[PDB]
Scaffold this active site. Structure first.
Site, PDB file in Angstrom:
ATOM      1  N   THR D   1       0.874  -1.188  -0.033  1.00 44.16           N
ATOM      2  CA  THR D   1      -0.035  -0.024  -0.077  1.00 44.16           C
ATOM      3  C   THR D   1       0.965   1.252   0.120  1.00 44.16           C
ATOM      4  O   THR D   1       1.906   1.294   0.705  1.00 44.16           O
ATOM      5  CB  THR D   1      -0.961   0.225   1.264  1.00 44.16           C
ATOM      6  OG1 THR D   1      -1.842  -1.210   1.401  1.00 44.16           O
ATOM      7  CG2 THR D   1      -1.792   1.289   1.194  1.00 44.16           C
ATOM      8  N   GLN D   2       0.445   1.968  -0.689  1.00 44.80           N
ATOM      9  CA  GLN D   2       1.119   3.462  -0.898  1.00 44.80           C
ATOM     10  C   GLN D   2       0.341   4.687  -1.169  1.00 44.80           C
ATOM     11  O   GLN D   2      -0.964   4.316  -0.819  1.00 44.80           O
ATOM     12  CB  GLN D   2       2.249   3.421  -2.159  1.00 44.80           C
ATOM     13  CG  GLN D   2       2.822   2.121  -2.702  1.00 44.80           C
ATOM     14  CD  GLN D   2       1.925   1.807  -3.806  1.00 44.80           C
ATOM     15  OE1 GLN D   2       0.632   1.800  -3.693  1.00 44.80           O
ATOM     16  NE2 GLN D   2       2.363   1.522  -4.683  1.00 44.80           N
ATOM     17  N   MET D 107      -1.381  -6.593  -2.502  1.00 47.31           N
ATOM     18  CA  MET D 107      -1.610  -5.188  -1.772  1.00 47.31           C
ATOM     19  C   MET D 107      -0.680  -4.428  -1.930  1.00 47.31           C
ATOM     20  O   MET D 107      -0.348  -3.470  -1.040  1.00 47.31           O
ATOM     21  CB  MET D 107      -1.767  -5.643  -0.170  1.00 47.31           C
ATOM     22  CG  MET D 107      -3.111  -6.518   0.026  1.00 47.31           C
ATOM     23  SD  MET D 107      -4.742  -5.573  -0.475  1.00 47.31           S
ATOM     24  CE  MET D 107      -4.806  -4.381   0.951  1.00 47.31           C
TER      25      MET D 107
ATOM     26  N   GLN F   1      -5.688   4.908   2.634  1.00 47.20           N
ATOM     27  CA  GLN F   1      -5.398   3.466   2.593  1.00 47.20           C
ATOM     28  C   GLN F   1      -6.074   2.714   1.314  1.00 47.20           C
ATOM     29  O   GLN F   1      -6.978   3.140   0.849  1.00 47.20           O
ATOM     30  CB  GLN F   1      -6.253   2.649   3.906  1.00 47.20           C
ATOM     31  CG  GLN F   1      -6.127   1.282   3.872  1.00 47.20           C
ATOM     32  CD  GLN F   1      -4.721   0.942   4.250  1.00 47.20           C
ATOM     33  OE1 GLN F   1      -4.060   1.419   5.017  1.00 47.20           O
ATOM     34  NE2 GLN F   1      -4.237  -0.291   3.501  1.00 47.20           N
TER      35      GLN F   1
END
Ligand SMILES: *[C@@](C)(CO)[C@](*)(O)[C@H](CC(C)C)NC(=O)[C@H](Cc1ccccc1)NC(=O)[C@H](CC(C)C)NC(=O)[C@H](CCc1ccccc1)NC(=O)CN1CCOCC1
Ligand SMILES: [Mg+2]
Lengths: 211, 195, 235, 233, 244, 222, 240, 231
Positions: D1-2, D107, F1
């Site tokens: 995730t970024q 992810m 997120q």
């Protein structure tokens, strides 16, 4: 859901409803909540449908392999334990399963409650699902060991009806089973809508409801 | 399961454990035996999170039974309790700790002495004349502190235990459906079928 | 010494060829396929009279529709049977159906050449895999430690194999009944066996669509032996 | 995730009778800062495909290198690398689509929205979209980001359904694309006046136009607008 | 490849013997004799150092007798370096048992553990076995005083009196002759030294060529004491028994 | 997120006849309030006389269909070109879905075809692999709009025979393919009116012993 | 890891390592198993080359795998410990996962499977051990006696012997053991087991070990004096 | 001699004997023929039986809708290699939406077989393969040897007595290459080619195995009464 099962003089009764919900929406009017593992073994389903189907159908694979290796049917006690051990591998991973393993073996009729936590309980009577409290009320007041096969089938059927009526997440139809030493016997699918009106008239119960 | 008691008298150890098992808002069973025989003269009662309790108990039972067969010899209650403690102390820093509290009642045949060990899920072991887990001690320890002698007979121990259960039944909000009582002495383990 | 997966100058794997010699020393097993079913029969060959012969299990159930007989180093067969039973039941789990006899046999044969320096050597046992499915009907396969499997109308493996195979060459036809096949296995077993054939030192079995795989009782086989003796004395 | 850092805005495209058009401005924004003004976000693959990318620029440059390597790899042991076994738009797209879905499944996505525009061997027009989630779809007109909200409505007035494609010429299609880019400059706060446009025709091949500018803009009416309601001066 | 150079240490002979185990036992038969004698009130461990020098520092030397814990000791016969590998493992096993059960490890359990390690080197791994034979002298509250031996095969047996290393045939005959069940430690000490004195390949048995140890309940009240004899103490017991 | 899931809308409908089966679904693909495509096929011919549609998150739906199609291919290779029965395909899909019990394919899946007796068959799956054979089933955004209509017009629920007044039910007479397609079209036309994610077009795949046939119908584009 | 294939086929179709493992069994002390009508007896030879032995602590030849099953052996002693340990672990593992003790047949099948695995695994040699496994299944009064060997084959026996001079005692058992009427009592069964060992043993002193296993986990080992009484009675009848 | 104990050892003349012994296993195997035109590619295989009660070992394996092979030698090794091809064909379709080129399929088999010839412990493959297919550059025929050598050909044959069929194809080269848009005539030429390798035995209904792939023809195998037409 509502499921129940109880031991008695002539084996074990198994009765379940058939409703499936996705929130307040009734996704299914007729879901099978009993698995046929072998001619002498049944499994009820409550909680996550997918979990109940997968793990109990995987139990049947493992119970079948037992028969091939040993040339002998697995006991109800051993089958229930294999299932509880599976639940214990995915401990806290979020599985939702509540089942009763019903059958006849050398010790006579057997009944085990098993759930996602790994709990495994032996007993004469069990009931799982959102409507179990309603079913227990009828069961506890009318249960005897000296029940006839005809009266016992009715008790389990009537107990599910009680739950289907009050519990919003229970209903559809009633699936009955009777487990003997010659194996289990299916005793039909009974629509609750029709069964309710029938029981009301014949029994005189549900006086508060108008029909 | 929530309630487990233990008392060590002159010549025996007495363990009392509740019979109730609850699921959601419904009591599923009122005759559950929360105990495992580890060896002929060692009994372990247990209480904690659902599932973990029986698993842990049966896992310990298997290990002690294995030892008994290998050496053709029964481990002392002290040795068993230390093994159990280590397993729990090992467990507490695991990814997923086993949430189980136990009482180990045993009769040491070498020393001819009853022994009661109380071990919580962290691996906190203490030898006691009487013990309990959870809230059980809050109600019962005042009675035990008052009435307990070390020279008590098994019958006197049972009477003092009845008084403890009566107090629990009066002041606890939860219905635990009575207790199953078991006695551990020189002759082994037996169950008191009327209590 | 030399590699386990080494080729000979003739283009054969030494170890596979040597395992075939071990199978020639094994007790005789015969299979006959008909349109009414497949029959499997074996020589028990007890090494002593004190050995309880009914504990000799050289005919084995893989599934309700598949049976199996073995010859050679019979201890090696246990893991093959275990794999076969797992494959058969696993397919039933994945596909809600019986598994094809050929597919089962192929799964067993995939183990065969998994040896090197995986297991350390090939299997020292041959299998007669007999079964029934809806697509290809009654089938009999011969699974070797080479990884090769042939389908057969009739086949004999073990010490009396080439003598029995010549006999099966003459006797087999496409219109054989199950009863005729039963007697034919007994006849050929009795011919190649050292000791006198009876219900205790020989075992019969069959696979039919209706009743599935069944190992015959010693009382049932005894009657078929008595029926054989009388029909041979009839001419 | 970024989270995306240096970003590229809308990529717009459409089909026409003999091929496809695709366009994208030359800006690399750093939040509200219009940091990099010389960024090319249309990347040709051979002479039959153009990949237009929006979203994170570092991830764009990564994809740019994967495609460059893909061409190199296809030529290996391939005598027909510049003929029958040359890279097709459908091959290039499915490769990216595979990568995008795999990355989201770990992810750790490539924070982009991609449009692969090209012409196949048999002369068929290819135009398909893929994003950071691995979601794919095809349509006569495709646009990313703000283009989806503003450009598509304009381009769908030219080609509303499949049957309108043969009726649409390259002059009409390019005109519609260039107008759409002007509208985005009026209304998208993270857009630039400078852009690149690419045409892939089944007859005339690949035409790549750089250093284009939005022109014929309407601003004069601004002089008459005074205050926010009641003010007259 | 590498197969060419593999000795294959873990194989049977045609006669059903383990080559390397047999050859390891041949090595051990040239090692200094070690003797263990069990009495009713204690155990004796005696052992002969191999052809020493006058310049060897004896008082800080240890090649034969080692301490496993406070209750158990071992006499070594074979490669000293190999023995130390096993000894440290045994010391750790004893401490593991103590940490787990809060009780001192029973002698047999320790012996079985070491013997199982030796066994493993004969069945798998392709490594040479340990060229070591032990005599275990120990005490626990179950069986009391115990003598065991283990050899490279991993096989172990219990004894009243036993010898390992050189001249075990001769030594075992002498022990079998003079040993009695009602024997005491002081008598056993004498028997051990007399046996070594007769079986030794040296011209005479002296203090500088011996290691000696006793395990006695001769500790103040119900407890056990290990005594690793000092050079001067071995010299005194040699005079006392009338050998020098 | 980062949110790995999304909603591409759409609605699907499977109905089992006496000797046929249909699997219908709209062709509109969306995110939030935008239309991605007015014609993006959602129901696929998977071979062996089976049709599938995985409705919900398109990326997961495409992945699942792609995997099952692959599962059919390898079923032929591994079992001598044997035809994959509809019941066997259903069980296979259950295991494909449960392989991600802890990172699910966010799709509601339906398949249709003919059983081994030649009768029509429809199977329904939840995202984590619970399946069941059914006669009638709508899935997706407008599933709650359509299903009650099918209970009434297919299974004749709450319908009794005039004159008897609730004593005798309406008999469960079988429906033809032409009758079913009428109910399908009226279902989607009604759903298009009241659900914003439904529209543009309707594609129906019909399965008989003769094979797989397609029918396309326009829907309102607003 | 060490992967070398030690157990391999030879041109004549033999696995020599497995056959040489049987030679190790031939070297081992004699072990015998005889099942009566309501019991099984396990007899074992103790070679009297080793005196000054401590018989209290010396590893006994018969090992309890569970409370209802026993295992004796012939061959390499160190190898037998590994099989016994694995068997004991599996016995507790079975009780734990299936909630029943192992059957004698199942335990035998497991031990035999371990032996087999060591005949086709890389880097390992076969166990130089043959076992006699005896006992009574839970809630069953039928006696069980099984044999295993290095190759991994196993089978059930009315009576069987293994180890050195087993050929001789098997000869004795084959003529003395009647299947139609097995040793009806414990006495008759023990007597026949001692008689069989007396064909081979040498002296009937501390060279014979006897272990009687009865139904419902009733296992006892006879003492020296008890066995000596059988030895006395046998030879006094023989003097005629 | 001293240099044939394993695959990792060159002989003094630079030969790899274990590879040559694997090549020998192919020569023992039953004959199979491959040939193609510009539109179609055909495999013809003589199947072998154990005896009269036994079935005839299958020789042809399908890899994809547009590709497949015939085998000669160790059948299990053909199963391993064909399984690898199935996966590679399948990887190309799933990832790139692209049918695997026959030339590239040959390059992959070459590299897979090669790794087994240079490493200790393993062994070379003991089978020869004839791969046919139809891709974007038309029809193709490949010959695979377990040495790693893969060769693109108009026609060929491998197995016992394969030299007879190979000579025939070398004469017929100019004729059969021109058989475009006529599958039956191309198979006839293949059946006539494999007939040059027969002795004592002849082509029966359960003996013969044929496969074909082409422009509008998926890879299909013909066995049993389906090949009685060509006998
Ligand atoms: C009574 C009726 C209720 O307690 C019974 O217990 C029955 C017994 C089972 C055998 C039928 N229980 C259920 O029906 C069970 C209720 C439940 C659900 C979840 C946890 C515990 C209990 N219902 C289900 O399992 C439903 C059954 C479907 C209709 C077959 N399934 C779901 O709810 C699924 C799974 C949950 C989920 C997975 C992945 C992502 C989100 C949710 N949920 C959905 O399909 C929700 N779906 C999301 C997308 O938009 C449409 C709705
Ligand atoms: Mg505490």
């Amino acid at each position: 859901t509502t499921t129940l099962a109880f031991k008695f003089q002539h084996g074990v009764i198994v009765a379940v409803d058939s409703r499936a919900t996705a929130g307040s929406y009734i996704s299914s009017l007729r879901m099978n909540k009993v698995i046929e593992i072998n001619p002498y073994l049944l499994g009820t389903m409550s909680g996550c449908a997918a979990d109940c189907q997968y793990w109990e159908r995987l139990l049947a694979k493992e119970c079948r392999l037992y028969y091939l290796r040993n040339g002998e049917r697995i006991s109800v006690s051993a089958a229930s334990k294999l299932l509880s051990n599976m639940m214990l591998q995915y401990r806290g991973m979020g599985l939702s399963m509540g089942s009763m393993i019903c059958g006849w073996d050398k010790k006579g009729p057997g009944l085990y409650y098993v759930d996602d936590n790994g709990t495994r309980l032996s007993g004469q009577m069990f009931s799982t699902g959102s409507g179990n409290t309603y079913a227990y009320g009828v069961l506890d007041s009318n249960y005897k060991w000296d029940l006839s096969v005809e009266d016992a089938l009715y008790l389990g059927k009537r107990s599910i009806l009680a739950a289907a009526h009050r519990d919003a997440y229970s209903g559809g139809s009633v699936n009955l089973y009777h487990v003997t030493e010659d194996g289990w016997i299916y005793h039909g699918n009974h629509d609750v809508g029709e069964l309710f009106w029938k029981v009301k008239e014949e029994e005189g119960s549900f006086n508060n409801v108008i029909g | 399961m929530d309630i487990i008691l233990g008392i060590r008298v002159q010549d025996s150890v007495i363990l009392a454990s509740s019979k109730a098992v609850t699921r959601g808002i419904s009591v599923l069973k009122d005759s559950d035996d929360k105990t495992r025989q580890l060896s002929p003269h060692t009994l372990m009662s247990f209480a904690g999170e659902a599932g973990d309790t029986v698993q842990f108990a049966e896992y310990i039972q298997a290990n002690i039974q294995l030892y008994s067969i290998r050496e053709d010899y029964e481990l002392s209650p002290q040795a068993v309790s230390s093994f159990v403690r280590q397993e729990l102390a090992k467990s507490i820093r695991s990814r997923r700790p086993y949430q189980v509290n136990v009482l180990i009642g045993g009769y040491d045949k070498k020393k001819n002495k009853p022994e009661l060990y109380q071990i919580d899920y962290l691996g906190t072991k203490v030898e006691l004349p009487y013990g309990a887990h959870g809230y059980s001690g809050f109600y019962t320890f005042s009675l035990l502190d008052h009435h307990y002698r070390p020279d008590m007979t098994t019958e006197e121990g049972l009477d003092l235990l009845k008084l403890c259960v009566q107090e629990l039944e009066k002041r606890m909000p939860m219905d635990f459906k009575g207790v199953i009582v078991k006695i551990v002495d020189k002759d082994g383990i037996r169950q008191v079928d009327d209590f | 010494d030399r590699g386990v997966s080494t080729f000979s100058p003739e283009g054969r794997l030494f170890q596979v060829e040597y395992s075939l010699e071990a199978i020639k020393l094994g007790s005789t097993a015969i299979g006959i396929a008909t349109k009414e079913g497949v029959v499997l029969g074996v020589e028990k060959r007890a090494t002593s009279p004190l050995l309880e012969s009914d504990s000799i299990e050289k005919i084995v159930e893989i599934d309700r529709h598949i049976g199996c007989a073995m010859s050679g180093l019979t201890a090696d067969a246990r893991s093959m049977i275990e794999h076969a039973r797992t494959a058969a039941v696993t397919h039933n789990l994945y596909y809600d159906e019986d598994i094809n006899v050929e597919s089962l046999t192929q799964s067993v044969c995939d183990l065969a050449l998994r040896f090197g320096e995986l297991m350390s050597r090939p299997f020292g046992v041959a299998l007669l895999i007999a079964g029934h499915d809806a697509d290809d009907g009654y089938q009999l396969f011969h699974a070797e430690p080479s990884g090769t499997f042939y389908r057969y109308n009739a086949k004999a493996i073990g010490s009396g194999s080439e003598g029995a195979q010549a006999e099966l060459l003459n006797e087999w036809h496409s219109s054989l009944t199950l009863k005729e096949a039963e007697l034919l296995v007994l006849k050929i077993l009795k011919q190649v066996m050292e000791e006198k054939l009876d219900e205790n030192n020989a075992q019969l079995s069959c696979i039919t669509k209706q009743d599935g795989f069944k190992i015959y009782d010693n009382e049932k086989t005894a009657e078929l032996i008595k029926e054989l003796k009388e029909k041979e004395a009839a001419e | 995730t970024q989270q995306p850092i240096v970003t590229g805005t809308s990529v717009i495209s459409m089909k026409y009778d003999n091929g496809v058009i695709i366009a994208a401005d030359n800006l690399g924004s750093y939040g509200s800062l219009l940091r990099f003004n010389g960024v090319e976000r249309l990347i040709p693959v051979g002479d039959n495909t153009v990949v237009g990318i929006s979203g994170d620029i570092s991830d764009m440059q990564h994809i740019e290198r994967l495609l460059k390597d893909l061409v190199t790899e296809n030529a290996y042991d391939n005598p027909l690398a510049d003929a029958e076994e040359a890279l097709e738009p459908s091959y290039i797209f499915e490769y990216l689509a595979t990568v995008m879905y795999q990355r989201r499944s770990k992810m750790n996505p490539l924070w982009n929205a991609i449009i692969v525009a090209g012409v196949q061997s048999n002369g068929d027009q290819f135009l398909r979209y893929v994003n950071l989630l691995g979601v794919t779809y095809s349509s006569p007109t495709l646009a990313t980001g703000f283009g989806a909200h503003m450009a598509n409505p304009l381009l769908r007035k030219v080609v509303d359904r499949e049957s309108d494609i043969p009726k649409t010429t390259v002059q009409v299609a390019e005109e519609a694309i260039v107008n759409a880019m002007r509208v985005l400059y009026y209304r998208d706060a993270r857009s630039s006046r400078n852009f690149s446009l690419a045409i892939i025709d089944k007859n005339t091949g690949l035409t790549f136009k750089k250093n284009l500018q939005v022109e014929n803009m309407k601003w004069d009416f601004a002089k008459d607008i005074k205050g926010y309601g009641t003010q007259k001066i | 490849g590498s197969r060419r150079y593999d000795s294959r240490t873990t194989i049977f002979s045609p006669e059903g013997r383990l080559y390397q185990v047999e050859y390891a036992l041949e090595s051990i038969s040239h090692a200094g004799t070690a003797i263990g004698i069990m009495a009713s009130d204690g155990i004796v461990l005696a052992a002969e150092r191999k052809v020493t020098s006058t310049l060897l520092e004896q008082d800080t030397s240890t090649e034969k007798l080692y301490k496993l814990n406070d209750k158990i000791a071992v006499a070594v016969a074979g490669l000293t370096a190999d023995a130390e590998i096993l000894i440290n493992t045994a010391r750790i096993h004893a401490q593991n048992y103590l940490k787990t059960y809060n009780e001192d490890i029973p002698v047999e359990i320790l012996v079985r553990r070491l013997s199982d390690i030796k066994q493993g080197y004969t069945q798998h791994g392709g490594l040479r076995p340990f060229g070591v034979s032990f005599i275990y002298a120990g005490y626990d509250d179950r069986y009391g005083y115990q003598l065991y031996t283990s050899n490279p095969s991993g096989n172990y047996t219990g004894w009243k009196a036993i010898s390992v290393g050189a001249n075990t045939s001769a030594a075992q005959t002498l022990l079998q002759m003079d040993y009695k069940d009602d024997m005491k430690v002081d008598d056993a000490i004498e028997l051990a030294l007399k046996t070594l004195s007769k079986t030794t390949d040296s011209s005479a048995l002296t203090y500088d060529r011996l290691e000696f140890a006793t395990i006695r309940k001769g500790a103040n009240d119900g407890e056990v004491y290990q005594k690793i004899f000092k050079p001067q103490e071995i010299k005194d017991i040699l005079v006392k028994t009338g050998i020098t | 997120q980062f949110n790995p899931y999304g909603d591409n809308g759409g609605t699907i409908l499977g109905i089992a006849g006496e000797d046929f089966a249909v699997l219908a679904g709209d062709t509109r693909n969306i995110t939030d309030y935008s239309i991605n495509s007015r014609y993006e096929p959602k129901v696929f011919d998977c071979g062996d006389n089976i049709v599938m549609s995985a409705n919900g998150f398109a990326a997961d739906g495409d992945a699942l269909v792609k995997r099952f199609k692959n599962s059919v291919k390898w079923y032929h290779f591994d079992h001598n070109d044997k035809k994959l029965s509809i019941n066997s395909a259903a069980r296979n899909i259950q295991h494909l879905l449960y392989s991600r019990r802890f990172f699910p394919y966010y799709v509601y899946n339906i398949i249709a075809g003919l059983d081994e007796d030649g009768k029509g068959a429809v199977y329904s799956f939840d995202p984590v692999g619970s399946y069941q054979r059914e006669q009638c089933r709508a899935g997706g955004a407008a599933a709650s709009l359509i299903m009650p209509f099918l209970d009434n017009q297919v299974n004749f629920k709450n319908q009794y025979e005039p004159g008897t007044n609730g004593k005798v039910k309406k008999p469960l007479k079988y429906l033809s393919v032409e009758e079913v397609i009428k109910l399908v079209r009226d279902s989607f036309t009604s759903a298009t009116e009241r659900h914003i994610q439904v529209g543009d077009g309707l594609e129906i795949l019909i399965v008989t012993k003769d094979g797989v046939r397609k029918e396309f119908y326009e829907l309102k584009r607003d | 890891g060490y992967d070398r294939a030690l157990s391999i086929f030879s041109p004549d179709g033999h696995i020599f390592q497995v056959e040489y493992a049987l030679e190790a069994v031939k070297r081992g002390t004699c072990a015998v198993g005889v099942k009566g009508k309501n019991c099984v007896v396990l007899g074992c030879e103790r070679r009297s080359t080793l005196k000054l032995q401590d018989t209290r602590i010396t590893p006994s030849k018969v090992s309890k795998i569970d409370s209802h099953v026993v295992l004796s052996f012939s061959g390499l002693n160190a190898d037998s410990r590994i099989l016994i340990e694995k068997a004991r672990v599996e016995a507790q593992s079975h009780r734990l996962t299936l909630e029943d003790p192992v059957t004698v047949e199942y335990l035998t099948r497991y031990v035999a499977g371990v032996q087999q695995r060591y005949t086709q695994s890389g880097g390992v040699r076969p166990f130089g051990v043959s076992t006699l496994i005896a006992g009574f299944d839970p809630r069953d009064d039928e006696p069980k006696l099984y044999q295993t060997e290095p190759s991994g084959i196993y089978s059930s026996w009315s009576a069987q012997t293994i180890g050195r001079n087993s050929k001789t005692v098997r000869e004795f058992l084959e003529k003395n053991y009647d299947r139609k009427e097995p040793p009806a009592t414990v006495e008759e069964c023990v007597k026949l087991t001692v008689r069989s060992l007396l064909e081979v043993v040498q002296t009937g002193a501390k060279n014979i070990e006897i272990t009687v296993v009865k139904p419902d986990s009733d296992i006892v080992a006879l003492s020296s004096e008890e066995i000596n009484q059988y030895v006395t009675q046998i030879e006094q009848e023989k003097q005629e | 001699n001293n240099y044939d104990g394993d695959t990792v050892t060159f002989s003094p003349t630079g030969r790899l004997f274990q590879v040559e012994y694997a090549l020998e296993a192919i020569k023992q195997g039953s004959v199979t023929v491959g040939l193609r035109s510009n539109t179609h590619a055909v495999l013809v295989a003589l199947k072998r039986n154990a005896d009269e009660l036994s079935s005839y070992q299958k020789k042809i394996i399908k890899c994809d809708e547009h590709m497949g092979l015939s085998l000669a030698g160790l059948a299990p090794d053909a199963r391993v290699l064909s399984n690898y091809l199935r996966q590679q064909c399948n990887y190309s379709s799933l990832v790139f939406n692209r049918k695997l080129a026959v030339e590239r399929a040959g390059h992959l088999l070459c590299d897979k077989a090669q790794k087994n010839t240079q490493s200790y412990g393993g062994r070379p493959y003991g089978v020869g393969l004839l791969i046919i297919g139809y891709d974007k550059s038309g029809a193709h025929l490949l010959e695979f040897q377990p040495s790693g050598n893969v060769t693109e050909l108009y026609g060929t044959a491998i197995g016992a007595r394969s030299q007879g069929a190979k000579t025939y194809l070398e004469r017929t080269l100019d004729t059969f290459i021109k058989i475009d848009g006529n599958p039956d005539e191309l198979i006839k030429a293949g059946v006539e080619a494999i007939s040059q390798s027969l002795r004592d035995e002849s082509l029966t209904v359960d003996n013969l195995s044929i496969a074909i792939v082409g422009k509008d023809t998926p890879f299909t195998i013909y066995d049993g009464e389906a090949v009685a037409k060509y006998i």
